[PDB]
């Protein structure tokens, strides 16, 4: 199996943010498995690979756009299919960046839940 951490990056502020601003770090370790696939989980998945999606604030209901950073996407080993569903795969024993996607976003002060699905893959 895999041991997964999802760690919030500190000192994120409301208002206009930097493009590709870091909001979380995903850590995936295994002693048995060489790779893993990762997808974001939400009501609004905005690309074919579930690597960009939208999350709603708890108190205001406002949406932000979140996903894997460009550099993290580029470190991908492959895009595989599981029951016809696209999963991007990465090397185990590595970390990835979760970021505010696209051009600079104006983030309303709130708490936003971020949920990731991770699975083991053998090439």
């Amino acid at each position: 199996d895999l041991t997964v951490s999802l760690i919030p990056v500190s000192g994120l502020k409301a208002g206009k943010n930097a493009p590709s601003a870091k909001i979380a770090k995903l850590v995936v370790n295994s002693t048995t498995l060489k790779e893993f696939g990762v997808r974001g989980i939400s009501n609004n998945v905005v690309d074919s690979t579930g690597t960009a999606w939208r999350v709603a604030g708890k108190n205001t209901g406002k949406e932000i756009g979140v996903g894997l950073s460009s550099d993290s996407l580029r470190r991908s080993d492959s895009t595989e299919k599981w029951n016809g569903v696209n999963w991007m795969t990465f090397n185990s024993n590595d970390t990835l960046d979760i970021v505010l996607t696209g051009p600079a976003q104006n983030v309303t002060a709130d708490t936003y839940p971020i949920t990731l699905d991770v699975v083991g893959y053998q090439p």
Binding site: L12, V118, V119
Partner: peptide
């Protein structure tokens, strides 16, 4: 290659944008 269904984990955290 192939996926390992039993190894699948959902994981979530709260991110906070503060004034």
């Amino acid at each position: 290659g192939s996926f390992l269904p039993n190894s699948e984990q959902q994981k979530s955290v709260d991110i906070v944008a503060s004034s």
